[PDB]
Design a protein around this ligand. Structure first.
Ligand SMILES: Nc1ncnc2c1ncn2[C@@H]1O[C@H](COP(=O)(O)OP(=O)(O)OP(=O)(O)O)[C@@H](O)[C@H]1O
Ligand SMILES: Nc1ncnc2c1ncn2[C@@H]1O[C@H](COP(=O)(O)OP(=O)(O)OP(=O)(O)O)[C@@H](O)[C@H]1O
Ligand SMILES: Nc1ncnc2c1ncn2[C@@H]1O[C@H](COP(=O)(O)OP(=O)(O)O)[C@@H](O)[C@H]1O
Ligand SMILES: Nc1ncnc2c1ncn2[C@@H]1O[C@H](COP(=O)(O)OP(=O)(O)O)[C@@H](O)[C@H]1O
Ligand SMILES: [Zn+2]
Ligand SMILES: [Zn+2]
Lengths: 555, 280, 548
């Protein structure tokens, strides 16, 4: 609504100077923020004089590499048409001793001399890393020079500084204060629509074959950053030319024009490129968008209503809470047998209020507990603040909360702004293992038990998992749902996967013999023969006893 | 493997390049080894050895020896490179065409096309090592001009270059005659139209080349006789005050830029003109 | 003619053998952009610029780069790491700048940055001002030349983790090539290449030498040839007059290297390729693995189908399984199963034994788990094999392994096989879905399997004609493959002892039945009955855990 009020309306005021807003896709909100912070102070400076404020200048973009930070900065600079001074981290740091400071001084001096200007300090983490990493005295001279130039600029006005870095913590803390890089923007991995837009942007000059399904590629590519999609397209084209190399004579200097005219990228080439590509964005904590509704989750209707009352009303109707003077709850804690669908509940909650989602699995928590990770709890919550509203899902919380890390989590959660919509949802299979400190009021104090699916819930789960897989017409799943009492969602997923495995084995055997385009009930029976409950009765009794204790203690 | 480019350079440069210039040393009393072999104190001394120069009271290293030192330090043979050219004259002008995503310098600039800070530092080598006047009359007449008129003077000196054995791989410019352009000398200085000077000097140089000479420097007089009865002059230029004022340094730099030294070890093909300036 | 016509500019594709896959990759990544730029103009793409080769030292990375450069006919600009880093302060950066500028000026060009791990070592390995200025200069040069030039950059390094991570992203060395140790045919080709000017004697059996050299990189083979020639010179030294400064041409004409010299050289060689994790080729079929037929079928339908028929998996919307976990008594033949699986899908093979994992746990190794999986990605399709996984999975190492298993691309053909003797002792986290979820029990061989093992182990030994092994196979109930191998080894030891005794007395060409009887007299089962009962109970519980 109002947030993207600046995006609504030759081209590019009419190399790397041709980049424009039409060369970007899937970052509408971040682009709106950057434009609102850059264009208005420069293009229309009289608004802030009329209303009587000094607009903030420092903007700090950060996200996984390849997300388009340099692209966004250059596009904004070229669309504004203002004196654009580009400073590269490594380029400044490669200079001799004493020159990497004079370069910064002259850069800022020139940017101040000329008309409304934009200074883009690309990779600022190179010239101002965290103090512990600033080894040497020149690494301190450069940081001090940067700080002095930043401080002495606040009076000048009509000059905006933009900086880009991979992680919020990678920068010296002194650079993130009032009169410095105060406004922060977080770039996350794009969603399906964003990936489709990027794919359309990149594949506009290729000789695509008519049998291309860019929507299918967008659906398949999950966790792919814009750079990953560009590499995907390049590798697909390389595969196409490799396939066509048979008709090409490498020895001859020139290739036949007719062959060059028959080049065409086919969907199979894109599938091969997907096979080869290796994204790395998800290796670190990132902000992602989710689109799970209250339909990928079966059952738990009472828990769904409880979650709605807990989260939706604070976000959608803050006025009522202000009227009654009651503040909303900060966090929730799911407990129950594994495979009951806690992550799906977290994603559904995030999608209901249309908030971003950050997930921190068990391995990440352990890696932070061992101090061998780039990020940290403070960094996670800084990203959550920058991307607010956000839902932070801490999975396998029992691994660390059996502590330094738990202390950091408590500090960050206590320091969270009450009115800022940043909810924290913890998941654990062993609620008694959780440290009692975390469960105090103002923390993950609202505990919710997630039970195993019931008959109708099992039927819904089985239908949902099998929807995108061909099956025998007139196939019944009621018997399978009924016979699997005590099975979690993971067990039903295993059953359907085994049925599919049997079907594919039969299909391959039939093709080799020379048929089986469905999944008949015999496959399901055979797969079910080797499937068993993954939750022991003792654990179920223990969870039921804990639930009974909680009910008795609260009534 | 690419090497030095095919470009004709002076005979003196070629014959200097042929030589090696090594300075042999005899068995030091600190050597521990038989007759055959050599450790560190008996190895031949490179022509650019700083200790040898400072011991012999030589203030610069005879440019050809500087080139030898650069070649020895860099450009491994048979591998490790494709012959990076060792010599490259400095250039401080801004890159008017960077287009790294920005318009030219006047309305945009990046860290790649921004001239870096300049660090002045005394040069450690000199192109021409000696300047030799064939006869005393050549400068006696030049000074007789001032003696008779009282104003200063200015003239180009013609000649040719040759070897100089008194310094390792050194060059001497031998001057045969001096030509004085039309200039308006004055009590405290002199002036001369640049256009007339160059227009006349073009044909004068053509004739001199036909005669075998070449233009190799400029000479001017800065004399102010003292009041003593004899013929004596004040020592205006000395250690604590200036040797060459700024204006004459600028003029000498312009003259050097206009007489490039064709060389075979630089991308442009020229480096540090062999043009000398003398003052009386 | 050839090569577009000692002097390293005289090397071509005919001087490299046994690396045709990586050679083809480098050629398609270098020649095509340079020789025929119009293809990418027609398709409207920018071909990738950087390429990063890595592998054990001595595997011929510099040789491959030189050969590709010479065959392309472009402007090769070899840059050394040690050579650049020996310059004074502020001079190495200038050399880098001048090299890149000259390469860009004379396009098309091929910049080869040899031993880049010395210019841009891992961020924790530099700790110096100059070591950071040089890295920043290299990054700036790489970024600047991304466009605006028809230039290709090639780099060589020992391991992926020995380079600054900033150099392995888009617009930089975004293509990886992994060089592994050659197989028997590759070693034969290398031997033929090297021993083409030598005065080989008639009795040379290069095939035999290739068979007897395992883990030998090309440098090792060159050293082997040099050592053999030196041994020949030593043997003929008796007729050489050291005092004289001349040697008769008659003696020189008599020089000739014989198989004995090559055997001596094999004896006196110190290969080091296998001391670190390395990608390698395997040639084990479903015939060396006697028995385990049901396990063979399970492995086939688990691994071969995803690799050979991905279209079916896409049709049914099923994601192929990542890895499996073998368990059972030691010596049951799990490594053979892993090698056979790798061979069937024609994939590479990376083996990580117990000592390597323990060394990583103690943090005193040059390779990490992330490095192993980077090599696996670069060499895909690959089979990673974690042997005796229970030593570490009794930890930060286990956490790293889980992280890497979660990270790996699903569509990538990288399969992780784990072997362990104590399935219960393994960390439960390793057995979750999306990880080594499948568990396979490898029992002791049966009578027919034992006889097959015995026959397989005796194909390289001169057994007595008309010999039988059914009695030995039946007598060894409960024995694993290792025990039967030990029985065969003891029989061979007795036979060779008797042969040596007979020769000294002076006959014994082949083993006899009594030798096997004597060897079996000392036979001992390596698995106690209690352990077998425990494994059977665990398997029965697992079957019950998968009941109706
Ligand atoms: N919407 C998009 N988001 C991200 N990248 C995009 C997008 N559309 C196209 N791209 C392409 O993806 C690549 C992104 O590279 P880019 O330099 O912007 O990444 P970066 O990691 O943010 O930058 P840097 O590290 O240089 O600051 C470029 O090829 C860009 O053309
Ligand atoms: N196919 C081959 N593979 C490997 N080495 C080979 C091959 N054919 C010949 N050789 C010999 O192996 C040696 C190759 O050593 P080389 O210097 O290329 O290896 P490297 O350790 O990868 O390189 P560098 O240290 O320069 O990065 C040379 O003796 C070469 O003659
Ligand atoms: N209502 C449901 N309850 C449980 N699992 C479900 C449900 N609907 C779908 N699933 C399946 O459960 C799996 C995810 O389980 P997950 O949310 O990770 O459980 P947990 O949080 O206990 O680990 C997916 O295969 C998903 O499709
Ligand atoms: N079918 C087989 N089962 C077991 N061992 C076998 C089999 N075939 C051959 N062997 C022998 O087993 C030995 C290797 O055993 P290995 O695979 O290391 O066992 P494990 O994996 O249990 O440690 C080799 O000497 C090999 O010849
Ligand atoms: Zn000596
Ligand atoms: Zn520029």
């Amino acid at each position: 609504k109002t947030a993207t009020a600046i995006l609504r309306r030759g081209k590019k005021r009419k190399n790397m100077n041709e980049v424009g807003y039409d060369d970007i896709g899937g970052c509408r909100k971040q682009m709106a923020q950057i434009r609102e912070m850059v264009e208005l102070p420069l293009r229309h400076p009289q608004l802030f004089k009329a209303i009587g404020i000094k607009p903030p200048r420092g903007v700090l973009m950060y996200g996984p590499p390849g997300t388009g930070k340099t692209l966004m900065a250059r596009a904004v600079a070229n669309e504004t048409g203002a004196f654009f001074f580009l400073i590269n981290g490594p380029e400044v740091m490669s200079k001799m001793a004493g020159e990497s400071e004079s370069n910064l001084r002259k850069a800022f001096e020139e940017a101040e001399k000329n008309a409304p200007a934009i200074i883009f300090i690309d990779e600022i983490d190179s010239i101002a890393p965290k103090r512990d990493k600033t080894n040497g005295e020149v690494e301190r001279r450069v940081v001090s020079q940067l700080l002095t130039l930043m401080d002495g600029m606040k009076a000048r006005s009509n000059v905006v500084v933009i900086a880009a870095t991979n992680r919020p913590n990678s920068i010296d803390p002194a650079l993130r204060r009032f009169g410095r890089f105060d406004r922060e923007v977080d770039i996350g991995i794009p969603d399906a629509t964003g990936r489709l837009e990027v794919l359309r942007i990149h594949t506009k000059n290729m000789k695509l074959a008519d049998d291309v399904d860019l929507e299918a590629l967008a659906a398949e590519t999950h966790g792919y950053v814009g750079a990953d999609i560009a590499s995907l397209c390049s590798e697909a084209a390389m595969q196409q030319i490799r396939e066509k190399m048979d008709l090409i004579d490498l020895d001859e200097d020139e290739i036949d024009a007719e062959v060059l005219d028959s080049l065409g990228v086919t969907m199979d080439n894109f599938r091969f490129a997907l096979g080869n590509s290796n994204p790395s964005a998800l290796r670190e904590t990132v902000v992602e968008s989710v689109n799970v509704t209250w339909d990928d989750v079966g059952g738990l209707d009472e828990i769904k209503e409880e979650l709605k009352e807990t989260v939706e009303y604070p976000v959608l109707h803050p006025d009522q809470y202000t009227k009654f003077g009651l503040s909303p709850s900060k966090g929730v804690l799911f407990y129950g047998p594994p495979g009951t669908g806690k992550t799906l509940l977290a994603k559904a909650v995030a999608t209901e209020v249309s908030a971003n989602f950050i997930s921190v699995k068990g391995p990440e928590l352990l890696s932070m507990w061992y101090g061998e990770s780039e990020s940290n709890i403070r960094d996670i919550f800084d990203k959550a603040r920058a991307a607010a509203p956000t839902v932070v899902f801490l999975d396998e919380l029992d691994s660390i909360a059996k502590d330094r890390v738990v202390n950091q989590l408590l500090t960050e959660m206590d320091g969270m702004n009450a009115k800022k919509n940043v909810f924290v949802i913890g998941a654990t299979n062993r609620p008694d293992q959780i440290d009692p400190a975390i469960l105090r009021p103002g923390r993950l104090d609202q505990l919710i038990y997630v039970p195993l699916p019931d008959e109708n819930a099992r039927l819904s789960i089985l239908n949902a998992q099998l929807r995108k897989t061909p099956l025998e017409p007139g196939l019944e799943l009621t018997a399978i749902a009924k016979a699997t009492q005590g099975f979690s969602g993971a067990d039903l997923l295993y059953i359907v996967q085994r049925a599919a495995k049997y079907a594919i084995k039969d299909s391959i055997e039939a093709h080799r013999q020379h048929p089986v385009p469905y999944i008949t009930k015999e496959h399901f029976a055979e797969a079910m023969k080797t499937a068993k409950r993954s939750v022991s009765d003792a654990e179920l009794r223990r969870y039921e006893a804990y639930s009974q204790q909680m009910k008795a203690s609260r009534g | 493997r690419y090497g030095p480019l095919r470009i004709k350079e002076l005979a003196v440069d070629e014959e200097l390049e042929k030589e090696d210039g090594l300075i042999p040393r005899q068995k030091s009393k600190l050597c521990k080894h038989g007759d055959r072999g050599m450790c560190e104190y008996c190895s031949p001394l490179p022509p650019w050895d700083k200790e040898y120069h400072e011991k012999n009271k030589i203030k610069h290293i005879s440019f050809h020896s500087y080139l030898k030192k650069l070649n020895e330090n860099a450009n491994k043979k048979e591998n490790g490179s494709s012959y990076i050219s060792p010599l490259s004259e400095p250039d401080f002008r801004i890159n008017k065409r960077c287009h790294n995503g920005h318009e030219p310098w006047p309305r945009g600039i990046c860290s790649k096309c921004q001239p870096s800070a300049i660090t002045l530092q005394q040069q450690e080598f000199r192109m021409v090592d000696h300047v030799e006047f064939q006869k005393s009359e050549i400068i006696n007449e030049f000074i007789q001009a001032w003696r008779y008129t009282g104003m200063q003077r200015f003239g180009y000196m013609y000649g040719s270059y040759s070897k100089y054995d008194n310094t390792p791989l050194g060059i001497k410019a031998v001057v045969e005659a001096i030509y004085e352009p039309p200039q308006h000398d004055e009590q405290d200085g002199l002036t001369m139209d640049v256009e007339q000077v160059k227009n006349e000097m073009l044909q004068i140089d053509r004739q001199a080349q036909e005669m075998g000479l070449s233009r190799i420097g400029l000479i001017f007089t800065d004399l102010s006789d003292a009041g003593a009865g004899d013929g004596s002059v004040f020592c205006k230029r000395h250690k604590d005050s200036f040797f060459l004022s700024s204006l004459e340094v600028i003029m000498a730099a312009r003259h050097q830029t206009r007489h490039p030294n064709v060389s075979k070890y630089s991308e442009q093909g020229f480096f540090s003109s062999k043009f000398v300036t003398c003052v009386i």
